[PDB]
Amino acid sequence: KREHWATRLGLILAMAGNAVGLGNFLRFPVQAAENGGGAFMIPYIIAFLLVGIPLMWIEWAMGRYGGAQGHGTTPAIFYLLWRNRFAKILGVFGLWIPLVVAIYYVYIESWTLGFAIKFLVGLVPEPPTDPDSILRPFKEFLYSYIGVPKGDEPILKPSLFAYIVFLITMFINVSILIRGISKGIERFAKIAMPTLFILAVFLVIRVFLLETPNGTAADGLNFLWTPDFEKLKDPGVWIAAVGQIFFTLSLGFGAIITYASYRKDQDIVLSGLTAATLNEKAEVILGGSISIPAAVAFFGVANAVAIAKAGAFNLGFITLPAIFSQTAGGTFLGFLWFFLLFFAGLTSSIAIMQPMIAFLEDELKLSRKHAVLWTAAIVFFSAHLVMFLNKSLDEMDFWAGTIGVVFFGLTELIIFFWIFGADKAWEEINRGGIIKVPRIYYYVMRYITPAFLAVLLVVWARHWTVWITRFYIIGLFLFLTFLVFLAERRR
Numbered sequence: 431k432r433e434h435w436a437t438r439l440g441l442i443l444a445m446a447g448n449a450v451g452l453g454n455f456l457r458f459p460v461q462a463a464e465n466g467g468g469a470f471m472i473p474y475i476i477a478f479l480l481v482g483i484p485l486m487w488i489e490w491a492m493g494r495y496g497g498a499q500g501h502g503t504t505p506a507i508f509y510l511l512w513r514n515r516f517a518k519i520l521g522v523f524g525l526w527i528p529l530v531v532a533i534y535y536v537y538i539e540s541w542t543l544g545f546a547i548k549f550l551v552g553l554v555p556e557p558p559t560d561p562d563s564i565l566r567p568f569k570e571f572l573y574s575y576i577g578v579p580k581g582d583e584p585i586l587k588p589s590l591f592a593y594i595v596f597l598i599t600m601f602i603n604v605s606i607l608i609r610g611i612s613k614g615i616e617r618f619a620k621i622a623m624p625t626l627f628i629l630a631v632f633l634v635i636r637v638f639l640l641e642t643p644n645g646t647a648a649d650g651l652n653f654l655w656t657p658d659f660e661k662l663k664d665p666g667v668w669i670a671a672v673g674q675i676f677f678t679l680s681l682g683f684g685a686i687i688t689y690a691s692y693r694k695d696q697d698i699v700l701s702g703l704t705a706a707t708l709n710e711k712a713e714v715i716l717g718g719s720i721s722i723p724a725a726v727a728f729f730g731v732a733n734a735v736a737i738a739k740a741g742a743f744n745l746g747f748i749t750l751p752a753i754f755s756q757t758a759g760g761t762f763l764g765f766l767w768f769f770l771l772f773f774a775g776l777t778s779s780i781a782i783m784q785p786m787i788a789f790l791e792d793e794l795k796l797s798r799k800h801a802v803l804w805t806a807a808i809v810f811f812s813a814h815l816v817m818f819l820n821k822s823l824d825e826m827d828f829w830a831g832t833i834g835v836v837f838f839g840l841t842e843l844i845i846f847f848w849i850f851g852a853d854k855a856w857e858e859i860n861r862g863g864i865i866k867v868p869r870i871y872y873y874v875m876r877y878i879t880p881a882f883l884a885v886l887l888v889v890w891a892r893h894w895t896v897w898i899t900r901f902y903i904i905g906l907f908l909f910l911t912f913l914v915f916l917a918e919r920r921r
């Protein structure tokens with residue numbers, strides 16, 4: 431018998447753990463600070479209402495609909511809606527995207543674990559005062575961990591501690607996934623989400639008390655929420671907003687679908703809305719009130735924007751620890767920060783590995799033990815690419831996490847609302863609950879959302895170390911297409 435979420439709330443809490451992750455505390459501050467903070471929020475809100483919320487309901491519908499027929503993954507669920515062979519091929523992306531994203535997501539999550547260990551024990555840089563002299567020791571601290579070469583070289587030389595901690599991170603993910611849906615993920619989400627909420631609120635309160643001659647914690651909140659309608663015409667802001675919305679809500683990652691497949695009795699309208707608002711609260715209230723207000727309080731708005739533009743990890747791994755280190759007990763604040771990130775990423779990595787696990791369980795009839803171990807071997811083996819090859823992690827985040835989920839999000843929209851039938855999809859979404867979707871969203875999900883994506887997708891169009899990554903992940907797609915072929919012959 432297929433696994434089962436014990437309670438309706440347990441699925442909602444695990445869905446919040448799926449959504450709330452490193453994108454709320456690491457990706458969102460960088461995206462907002464890059465695109466002007468407040469000027470970024472208007473397209474972010476519009477993208478959340480026109481793309482985020484509707485796609486959250488759809489994927490939950492396809493998952494619950496497919497889960498009633500014993501299928502959790504997209505290759506089988508796409509075929510149920512569209513009885514076509516090409517539907518199974520496009521469904522491979524629902525296994526390929528979560529696999530490629532988990533290759534680098536779990537590794538970045540291992541950094542938060544390793545940093546939390548050394549910050550707890552107190553093995554952090556020592557500063558004695560220009561901002562560069564406080565920020566430089568922590569920049570060298572991160573570069574020694576992941577093994578960045580001095581200047582430019584195609585090969586990374588990560589530390590032995592980082593490689594060992596990555597093994598521990600893979601072991602922790604397996605330990606949770608090996609126990610299953612109810613006894614493992616649902617059990618862990620009930621504990622991690624309150625811990626996530628308590629740590630973040632404590633950090634937000636501590637950050638809010640920071641004040642220097644150059645800035646105030648409230649100055650960063652004013653920078654993030656004062657809108658700028660002049661930058662509304664910038665297409666780059668709309669691209670960053672929709673891409674951010676896809677990432678934080680786990681849209682196009684095939685993770686919402688498999689999670690929803692383990693519960694037939696569920697109001698997907700209220701459950702999908704609760705999980706989204708829970709994620710957006712942690713994103714713009716908690717994640718938005720830590721990194722940006724602390725950076726602005728110590729360096730000002732102008733320098734805080736330049737810091738977020740220097741790198742994706744420059745804020746949460748370098749600037750925020752160095753800022754904390756200038757305060758009493760800041761080494762412990764650093765520990766609480768990365769411990770906050772570790773629980774945020776751990777509850778999301780187990781969510782993006784279950785799709786490949788559910789495929790081996792449901793389509794190839796493998797036991798959960800063998801399913802978890804085999805997908806873990808795929809993730810651990812492939813992770814050596816992003817561990818040692820410079821810019822290899824950036825190529826995976828682009829193809830699978832950036833352009834893939836947008837392409838896959840439009841694909842599941844068309845299959846569900848255009849091929850399967852808009853009225854059948856509308857019936858399936860609002861079925862089985864007291865909360866019903868307003869009728870206006872029927873036109874958003876049938877006309878607005880697909881046109882909004884397609885228009886934004888075509889308006890997007892305007893070192894050999896990347897070819898190894900392209901060559902590798904292409905083989906990952908061919909390998910998963912092969913198993914979908916094998917699972918079709920067994921049936």
Ligand SMILES: CCCCCCCCO[C@@H]1O[C@H](CO)[C@@H](O)[C@H](O)[C@H]1O
Binds near residue numbers: 587592593594811814
């Ligand atoms: C399935 C493939 C397994 C490959 C295992 C390779 C492990 C290499 O690990 C190496 O150990 C060094 C020890 O100093 C460290 O510098 C680094 O972690 C790494 O270069």
Ligand SMILES: CC(C)C[C@H](N)C(=O)O
Binds near residue numbers: 452
């Ligand atoms: C599930 C992951 C791919 C994304 C997750 N929502 C995060 O922001 O970390």
Ligand SMILES: CCCCCCCC
Binds near residue numbers: 814
């Ligand atoms: C330290 C010698 C081997 C390092 C390269 C192996 C990584 C797969």
Ligand SMILES: CCCCCCCC
Binds near residue numbers: 585815819
């Ligand atoms: C001499 C160490 C280089 C290791 C390269 C690893 C490529 C996967």
Ligand code: NA
Binds near residue numbers: 449450452454680709
């Ligand atoms: Na998120």
Ligand code: NA
Binds near residue numbers: 450451452774775776
């Ligand atoms: Na999570």
